[PDB]
């Protein structure tokens, strides 16, 4: 009923910390994201992840990073974790040079496309917008 956690490593944790964006994207600087990334780094480090932080990544870079990780050998890892900190719209996240679909980033870790993470949890934590609506609340 539980995932088997008995491995040498908990797993890889990729933190993508996009703060500064190409002017062509029209997106403003994400102040505060550095404090997020630092707090996230410590948290997931404490859990037991091997955490690496990449900053102001292009869409190509973000694609390559996840693609490369999916191709790594995770045989000795309990799980995989990735954290995205950026601007966003629904189904898509901003690189510094534009947007790219979240599906494309995560699909590299599908069962048929990453056998060493088969039957192992694949975690994606995403801090980004998913549209423009706002919650007015109630009561």
């Amino acid at each position: 009923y539980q995932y088997n956690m008995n491995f040498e490593k908990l797993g890889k944790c990729i933190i993508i910390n996009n703060k500064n964006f190409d002017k062509v994207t029209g997106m403003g600087v994400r102040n505060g994201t550095d404090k997020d990334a630092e707090a996230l780094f410590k948290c997931f480090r404490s859990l037991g992840f091997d955490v690496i932080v990449y900053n102001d990544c292009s869409c190509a870079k973000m694609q390559d990073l996840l693609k490369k990780a999916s191709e790594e050998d995770h045989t000795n890892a309990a799980c995989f974790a990735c954290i995205l900190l950026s601007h966003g719209e629904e189904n898509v996240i901003y690189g510094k040079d534009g947007v790219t679909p979240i599906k494309d980033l995560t699909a590299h870790f599908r069962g048929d496309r990453c056998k060493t993470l088969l039957e192992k949890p694949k975690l994606f934590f995403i801090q980004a917008c998913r549209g423009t609506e706002l919650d007015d609340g109630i009561q």
């Binding site: 994400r30 505060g32 948290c43 949890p121 549209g131």
Partner: protein, 93 residues
């Protein structure tokens, strides 16, 4: 025999589809603040859905915006967990 390709994924979004996400330039975004605080005190003893549920609660209750614009005052946020997991997940033992 077989296992589905889309299985064993989990997505912890900071907000629901169609909606914005809040970030305070001084202390950081709401979702991350809450996520970390819950992980620092319960990361190794609670199951992941329990963790993310407490995060949902905290972001929902503890936070509400202040802003120098009539479009961002009094605003709220609720995160969004998407689970394709097939087991309970604990980060220890």
């Amino acid at each position: 025999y077989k296992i589905p390709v889309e299985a064993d994924f989990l997505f912890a979004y900071s907000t629901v589809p169609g909606y914005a996400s809040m970030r305070n330039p001084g202390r950081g975004s709401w979702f991350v603040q809450a996520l970390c605080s819950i992980l620092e005190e319960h990361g190794k003893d609670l199951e992941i859905m329990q963790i993310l549920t407490r995060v949902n609660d905290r972001v929902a209750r503890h936070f509400e915006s202040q802003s120098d614009d009539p479009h961002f005052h009094e605003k709220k946020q609720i995160p969004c967990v998407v689970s394709m997991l097939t087991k309970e997940l604990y980060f220890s033992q």
